[PDB]
Structure formats: structure tokens, C-alpha cells
Symmetry: D2
Subunit: 344 residues, 4 copies
């Protein structure tokens, strides 16, 4: 072990669960959102799932201010939308970079992961206790045990949709999971992933006591695809139509979540408003297959760099660029209006 | 934990290491091979690394005969080739299927992963102890702790080359590592992986004691690309030139390993060997290694002895020819 | 595994330290107290260490009211007494009924040990945050990792004083530890235990992470004898002198703590007051070896059996004295400390 | 905290059990011995149990020689005696002192407990694999998981017979256990111990994986008292009657094992030969209640202190040499023959 520089102690998940148990209302928020997404996935509800919020969490203060604003819109629009806040603690990097709040909460390569786990779970508890469900991307294999009970929906990243260990992880998650199409636009990897995840697996994992063990999962049937573009955007009716047939062809429900960001906006954050307009016209025109959308959204639009010394502006993303609150409130009302027109 | 059915006990790595310690022979085998591959990658040895063996190990018996047959050609062609056995204990699947000897040693959905780890560590030690180095595919984040000390070279599968968790594992592995290109011929995901895996990382992983912990890695500079083609073969001297440019454009050594199988019909590996031999004989010093899928008996099955139950492989006769063709192509590149 | 019926999961100590972290006030209560007992055992303080409290805790609510009352007397008599609340959770018992608060918090043989450890640590935390130092009995090797950070003083049983495993534990404890004389009143085992615990040791223990490990102790020099009788009481001046001699002969400070209960009170709770009277006479007369006293005390006197509502503030284990006798005993002990000074 | 100097890593019992597993032979040796001693404690075999061997194992070579010699008299004096060897890896000290092979195998205060466990298991494994049953004093709470599967009979020391944790340990031990009388001679403590051990207990312990857990035991019936004297010996048919009186009074089988050593030997290893005569007369006299005996025997008699040390001699309590050992075993084999 000459490439392993140092080994440090890591709190077991039981300690984080004991320090920060779920309140009654937080468990109620998680259980009700999970069930509401299941019902949307089963076709038994015509509301739209909206996973929306910052590309990454770096500030518990801005996240909770964002959560309050979003929760007010969640209550107002709840006949049309099942609104779930992006509470992403883990970021996959193209090569190297800040991996998110849990890996480095102080954002300075001190890698205080025990503190990161504490900060993240407390935040998740606070947000669920307020009544707002949370979504996360499941990237690490060990962190889920610290946080999954407060997660109402999860995503597997486009760069890990093919990874067996991530499909194994999804097959044991207690929440619904969405799988992104390939970074080049390929639909087949995600379809395979949905099927892999619907099956039981047996593999090595870590328990809530921090020990490795042999686990057996039952398969997760609440899995679905996320369209995030490839070389070109793939949100348009022609692409929805192709995905639907590909899914049916493989014996899976013909339903999609559409990500407005990333490749579907050509990496231009304000173009998420142009995807909303085409998606809203599709829904308002009667497309039932669109069961969810994803939007990268913060208090203040744009982004900033930790590298730049310029002091960090408040409520502004340090990873990908996000739309700001004004566009977020207007975007959500557009989606609600389209769900309602689809219905009448 | 609704979708979790059962949790069973798993032997800590420290246990299989105490039951099956590396002999002084195995340690020297792993060490010399790692150092030899490092020298080949620094460009201070004109020999070619040959990673050859079955697609998946399933019978320790057939596997030990192969290791003996291959050890003879190893000592014979050592002035030209650094020969390493493919001992693959973790198998990646497109959706569902057998994941290897570790996940289900009895191959019967009993998942005796504790026995699987015993059979695997014993075979690798025996192979290394004889003097034959060993190669594996690192797919799982936990199993490496049981075997990596007997590993001289490792491969990250094409499905996980873009994964941060696999790039973190590579950054701390004591063996040199090869990243395969994308299931569509892309070299960028592999160049990004080599750069990621060369940087230091901090992440969560299970220790030899079976407990989760925070690890810091130093970075792995012994990483290189593996050309496995995509929709079309990428082994020709045209594609090689493109990859070398990409690596220079990306500030990486212009060295490559060509996987003769898959995108690049088991027999076609012999044609790729000719193409590759010609490139090497012609003076291509960038092909620093190759990988071939070989077994005692050629073919595949869904049980014959020395025959693959995974991907189809070349038999031994074509393997002795492949190896001499390479050792000849090598001497041409020297004189 | 023939005689092992079931193995269940146990919360690692790190989990209870994470849920119930020491407050700054609690840590100051533990630090200051441990330091005050050290000054008394080194002859640099003339005050008496009084470990007083219930035989066992079964109700955190009555424990906290008791703690509040004792806290008031702790401050009023601080110039004469270092008052430490007895927070024990179980009565060691060949032939057994209730197995303690940690073992069986719900008093129904359900053995919700994880619940017990939670209840136990929260109680200790709350008592130390108030400013009342706490004392416990170390009976097992595993539970101390979950509570010793909030213990200012510890006792090793008389059925365990001859145990190397208990002497090893005490060698690593951060709190002063008292060893009890033999069930036969003999002081040889208690002297052997002080010498062993003052020595450095290496032994197998469980860590804060709930894993077995090799530990090395510095040895503990704040260990002392506890006189609790044998077949007959051993609190009399005759007995103290006979113990003070054996101690000096053995190279240990001639100092004792006297347990007013059990054999020294003929198993009659009210006689703890007759022992207080004899000890207060020895002290006010000048005796300086008596550094401490151990008294079994609750809100309400006597005892009760577990079966249905129970009486508040009354021991469910051994019979204790009530508050009135407790306030008077504490004032008697203080007034004697005042006289010993001259 | 302050009184903890260093915490170091410790192999879990699962690692010692995988590197040094039990051979079929070793397993049979342990299984048979346990069943035999049980039949003896049920009163279905007139034979006598003989716990014989060094006070402490400190040299696996001298130990394997002793074992070869003893395995002979076991298969010869086998119709009258059940010979089990004392393989003690851990020793109680009056205050401070070497704690045995596991705590300090190199007797240098290096405290290489991980090496000590490896050495100990391989020996016990070897001795059992040769066919010789084994015995030890269970003093540590954590070591039993590494060794107990190769133990055919155990003992709880006199200074620990009163310990709750020790009585809990015996309640779950898969082998018969003996409880030494109290250091002063008190027999009650060992009667209470026998009664606790037969009952079920729920307590905290460490698993085979080195992890603390909540364990439930089933209670152990195969427990019995060990007479070791006190301020004065307690092996006279007089005492034996007083003890059986108490055992019956407590509903306990009126059975005893006599340790011919320690305070019963007034700390002079030679008196073990004297105690043997008294005990053997009682057995020829018809005493059916003496089911076992414990003897301290090494290849070379006497004791040595802890640079180089002498072979065959104890570094702990002084023992009887092989010569006296073979004679003693044949004495016992004789008295049993008469009792029949």
C-alpha cells in the first residue's frame, strides 16, 4: 500500500442516525413523496414530478432559504406538481475537482468527511421536517447508508449508468431512482440499467455498523429514464417518441423524465427556459409519457469559482450554472399550467 | 431497508491474508512484474507486456495447467515479452448474469462469496508463487482488499472508465492500471481517467479489517489506455497515430495497449496480432502492451475442461504462435 | 455456539457520544471534580469526599429531582465536602431479579440494552450539566466506554476486587477508583488491587468504535480502599487503625473511604446514621485517614419490590435513607470536617 | 483519555480460525473429551478426570514433548482416567507479573498479543490434532473466541469465581467448566458460581468478528467445584463430606475435583504427591464423588524466574517433574481400579 497515503476513522451510519433521527414529520414527508412518485410511475396519477434545486449544495444557509421558497410553491402548485428539492451532496468530476459537501464541506481540501456527513444529514433532516422532500444523486457506495432514509428520489449519473455497482445499489434503494442516458446520448445503457436494477442482486456492501457484508436486494421497480441530451439535445417530441418505443420494445413502461440542464440546454443555463416551453407545449398537447422534469435552479442565477479568490457571492452555485429564483418561480408556474391543460 | 432482503457475514480481508499469506516467491513475482511494467511505461525497456489468459477463471484446475503452460513461454520469450496471466475474478455484465468466481464460486446462485474469496486468493498465490505474474479486472470497491497484493497489473472495465469511484480506486492501487476506451471508441473518457487516476484522492473505502474508513491516495502515474475499439476496430496504425496525438495533445505519454478481442470472432485476434506485429516490427514503439483472450481449448460454452464459459478465446496452439509472432515483431523493432 | 442462543446488534460507543455529547458545563464538572478528589487523596485538601445517592437508578425523573436537591447541599457545604452523586444503574446479585437500568431499563426482562445505554448516558449528561459530579460502579469491561467521560469517581465491586480484568480496567480509567475490602473484611485483596492498578498494563479491550483492540495503560495512582465490612462492621477507630497500619506497611497512603451501608450497617438502612455518628466522631476528633464516605440515599426511604404503579423516589433494590436523614447526615459530616480542622 | 497510552490493531477471532482451522482429528479429540467428562459428571463413568500439565505454557517445544509423553499414559491409563492436558495461555497475578503466552509470548514486555494468539492456537491445534484433549483457565473476556473451540474443559480461577462476567462466560462455554473455591476456602462462592453458570444470561461480549454485541447464553449444566484449599488445605475426606453436604443442600450434584497443588500443597510442589495418597485412599475407600483431579506437572520439576532460561521448568508456579508425574498417574489409575 504505497499509493495509500493515510487512513482515518469514519463515523458509522448508526451514529449519524442516532445523533439525527428522523422526526415524525420528516419520516412522513419521505414516505408520502416516495408513494406519490410510485403512483405517478404506475400511471395512477397525472401530476408531474419536478426535481429542482441547486446543482450542488455548498451552503446550508442558502439551501434552507431556497427550501422555504420552494416549499411555498410546492404547497401552492401541489394539485399539478410533486415538487422535490435537489439536495445533491456528491458531484462527479470530468477529471478532478470539488466532489461536494460530504467529501470536503469546508471547500478547501481539508476533507473533513465526518463533519460533511454531519452537516449533510442535519440539512436533510431540517428540509424534510419542514415538509419538503429531497432528491440526491447516488455516486459513492458508502454514503447512502447515512442519508438514504431522508431521500425521496435518487439519480444515477450519466457517467455511472453503465456501472454494475451503481445498478446493484439502485436495486436495494428504498426510493425511486432515475437513470440518465449516456453522455453521448445513448438510450440503451439506461434501459439496461432499469432492467438490471429491477432484478435482485447479491454483492458486497457496508452496513449501518460500518462493516462490510454480503447483501441481497429484491430489485427496484420504481426506476425510470432521464433524458439529458448527448451531442445534441434530446428533449423534443421526436426523441420522446423514440425513447417511448425503445422502452416498450424492452418491456418497460413508456415514460420519461426530462432534464432541462446539462446537454439538453447546450450547457447554457437560461436555455432551460426554452426546454420548459417545448416540454410544456408537449404536456399541454397531451403527452402523458413525460412524468417528470429536472431543473438546476438556485437563489441567484449563474455560477462562481472557488478558484477565483473573489469572495463567494451568497446563494450562487460553485459548480454548474443555475437559473435564479425569478425564473424558477415562473418555470414552475409554466409547468403547473401545462399539467392542468393536459388534464382538461 | 425495504428492498434489502438479507445481510450475511463477510470474512475480513485480514483473515484471507492470514490464511493465505504471500510466500517470498509470490511477493518477488508481483514486485518484479510491477517494476518491469513501470520500466516499459517510462520507456526504459523495449519489451512488450502480454496480458493473456481466459476471459473468466471458473476452474482452479484448468487455470493452474494454463499457468504452467504459459510459464514456459514466459521464461522462453522473456527477453522480448513481459508475460502476465489474465486471472479475472470479477466479470461485468450488460444487464444480468454470472459476475465471476468470487460472486458465485459454485456457479449455482448460492453466492458463496466467502468460499469464492478463498478459492481466488489460493489460485493467485499459487500462480504468483510459481513465478507467473497475474492480472485482474477491478470492478468491485471491496474485493480488491483481498487480492490486490497478488496483482501485477489491472484493468478498469469499459463500462466503468468514466466512474469516479473506479478512478479513485485506481489512484491508490499498488499495481499499474489500464483504462479501456469507450463502448463507442472515445479516447477522452480514458484520458480523463488517466489524469484523474494520477491525482491524489480522498474517499471512503473498506479497510483490511472490514470496516469503512477515510483513505488518502497519492495518485497512480502507471496508467495507460487500452484500445478495445467501438462500433469499429481501432487497432490499425491509423487509429494508433490518432490516439498518440490525443495523448500528446492531453500531455500524456503516447503509449497504448491493444486488446485483440471484442470490437477490435475469437479467431480474429490472430489477424489483429499480424496487423499489430507489423506495426511493431515496423518500429511502432508506442504499442507497449497487448491483451489476448486465450484458454486451453478454444471457443465458449453456456462443462468442457479448459474451455471458456464467458467470452470465446483462442486455444493453446494459436497462443504459442501469437506469443512467438509478438516476440519476433519485438526483436525487429530493436535491431 | 451450543450454549449461545442469540447475538444481537449493539450501538458502538461513538454513536452514544455523538447523540449525547458532553456539554462544556458537563466536562468542567467532571474535570474539576476528578481534580478535587486527587487533591484530597494526596493530602492537599482536608475536605471529605461524599459519594451519596440511590443504590440503583430506575427512574430518570426521580434521579433528576434528587440531583437537584443534592446540588444545593453540594454548594452550601463545598468548604467541607466534595459531594458526588451516586449514579449506579444495577445491583450485582448472585440470585438475580432486575438486572439494572442499562441491562433492562424497562424493568420487564426485555434487555433493551441499547435503550438502557441511551437512557443511562442522557441521565449522566443532564446531571453533570447541572454541576453535580457523578460516581459509578464498573462491573463490566464494555459499558465503561459509553459513560466514563461523565464519571468523576468509580468503584470496583468486592466480588471483583481480586480480578485482574477489573484491576486492568482501573489502570486505564480517567477517574479516581475505589477498591472494596473482601466480603470477609480482609484488606489484602484491596491492597493487592491498588498496587496492580497503579501499574501500567496491556490487555484486550473494546474501543469507542465497538471493535476489539490492544490497549496500554499508564496505571492509576488515584486508587483507594473502601471499607464496607465483612462479617462484622469495620468502620470503628480500632478497624481504621488496623487498616491504616496495613496500608503504611504496604507502601500505600494510610487513607480510607468508609461505606456507611451494607455490612457496616447490618443491612439496616437507618443504621447508616449510627455509622455517620461514629465516623463524625473519629473525624472531629482529628482522624485524617477518613478521606471519604459512601452512603445509600434516595428521596423516600426504605425499599419496594417490582411488580403496576410503583412508589416515587423509593429504591427498587437495596433500602436507602430518605432526604431528611440525608440532609442531617450531610450536615453532621460537614460539622465534623469543621471540627477536625481545630 | 489520560491513562490510555496506545491503542493497537488486533486480529479478530475469524482470522485465527481461518489460518489455524481445526482438523477432523482435533475436532473429534475435543468432541469426545467433552462428552466423556459430561458422562462422568452425570454419574455414568467411574473414571477420574485428570487436569495435568504446566502452570503456564511458555515454550511450544517443551510443551509438545510433554504432550507426547502424556498422550501415552492417556491411552494406557485410559480405562480408569480421562487425561486432559493443562494448556494455560493466561495466568492471574497477585499484583503484577507475566500474564502468560498470549499477553507476552516473548517474555520481553513486547506484548505481541497478535503473535501470542497465533502461537497459542497452533499449539492447542497441534496437541488436539495428536489426540490429546486440552484444558485452560478462562481469565480473559476477549481471548476465549480465539481458542475455546479447541478447549475440552475449562476453569475459572479462584480470584474470579465470584466475577459476574466470568459466570456469564461459563453460561455460554461449549465445554464443561470448573469453579475454584474461594481464595480463603469459602465453598459458597463456587456454589453460587455453579448456579449462575447453569442459568441463561444476557450480556455484552465480543463476537468472532471482533465486534461488540449483545449475547444470550443458554446456561451450562456441566459445571462443578474445584477444591484448592485456602489458608489451610481442604482435600481431607472431612472437607469432602462438608462440601458434598453443601452441594446437596443447594440441589447441586455432590461431585468434586481436587487440585493437589497451590495452597492445598502449601505452595511446595512436592506435597502434590502427598495429596495424591490421601485422595487415592478415598477413591479406593469407595468415594464416588471425586470425579476429577488437577495436577501441576512439567518435564522438569521446580520453578525458574524471568536472560536465557532452562528447558522443562516452569516460569510460574513450581510443578512436579515427569518422573513423579508418571508415578502419580499410575497411582490414580490404581485407586480407581479398586473403587470399582
Amino acid at each position: 500500500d504505497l499509493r495509500i497515503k493515510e487512513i482515518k476513522e469514519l463515523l458509522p451510519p448508526v451514529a449519524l442516525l442516532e445523533k439525527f433521527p428522523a422526526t415524525e414529520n420528516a419520516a412522513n414527508t419521505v414516505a408520502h413523496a416516495r408513494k406519490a412518485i410510485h403512483k405517478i410511475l404506475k400511471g395512477n396519477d397525472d401530476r408531474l414530478l419536478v426535481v429542482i434545486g441547486p446543482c450542488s449544495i455548498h451552503d446550508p444557509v442558502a439551501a434552507k432559504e431556497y427550501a422555504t421558497r420552494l416549499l411555498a410553491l410546492r404547497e401552492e402548485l401541489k394539485d399539478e406538481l410533486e415538487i422535490v428539492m435537489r439536495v445533491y451532496f456528491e458531484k462527479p468530476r470530468t477529471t478532478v475537482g470539488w466532489k461536494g459537501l460530504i467529501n470536503d464541506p469546508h471547500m478547501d481540501n481539508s476533507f473533513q468527511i465526518n463533519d460533511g456527513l454531519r452537516i449533510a444529514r442535519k440539512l436533510l433532516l431540517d428540509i424534510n421536517d419542514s415538509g419538503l422532500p429531497a432528491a440526491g444523486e447516488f455516486l459513492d457506495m458508502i454514503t447512502p447508508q447515512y442519508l438514504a432514509d431522508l431521500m425521496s428520489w435518487g439519480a444515477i449519473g450519466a457517467r455511472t449508468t453503465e456501472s454494475q455497482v451503481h445498478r446493484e445499489l439502485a436495486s436495494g434503494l428504498s426510493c425511486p431512482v432515475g437513470f440518465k442516458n449516456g453522455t453521448d446520448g445513448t438510450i440503451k445503457v439506461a434501459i439496461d440499467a432499469i432492467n438490471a436494477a429491477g432484478a435482485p442482486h447479491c454483492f458486497l456492501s457496508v452496513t449501518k455498523w460500518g462493516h462490510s457484508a454480503i447483501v441481497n436486494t429484491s430489485g427496484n421497480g420504481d426506476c425510470h429514464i432521464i433524458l439529458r441530451g448527448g451531442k445534441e439535445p434530446n428533449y423534443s417530441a421526436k426523441h420522446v417518441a423514440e425513447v417511448k418505443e425503445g422502452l416498450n420494445k424492452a418491456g418497460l413502461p413508456a415514460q420519461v423524465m426530462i432534464d432541462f440542464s446539462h446537454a439538453n440546454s447546450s450547457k447554457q443555463f437560461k436555455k432551460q427556459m426554452d426546454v420548459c416551453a417545448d416540454v410544456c407545449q408537449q404536456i399541454a398537447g397531451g403527452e402523458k409519457a413525460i412524468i417528470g422534469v429536472m431543473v438546476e435552479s438556485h437563489l441567484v442565477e449563474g455560477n462562481q469559482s472557488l478558484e477565483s479568490g473573489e469572495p463567494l457571492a451568497y446563494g450562487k452555485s460553485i459548480t454548474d450554472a443555475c437559473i435564479g429564483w425569478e425564473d424558477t418561480d415562473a418555470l414552475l408556474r409554466q409547468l403547473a399550467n401545462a399539467v392542468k391543460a393536459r388534464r382538461g
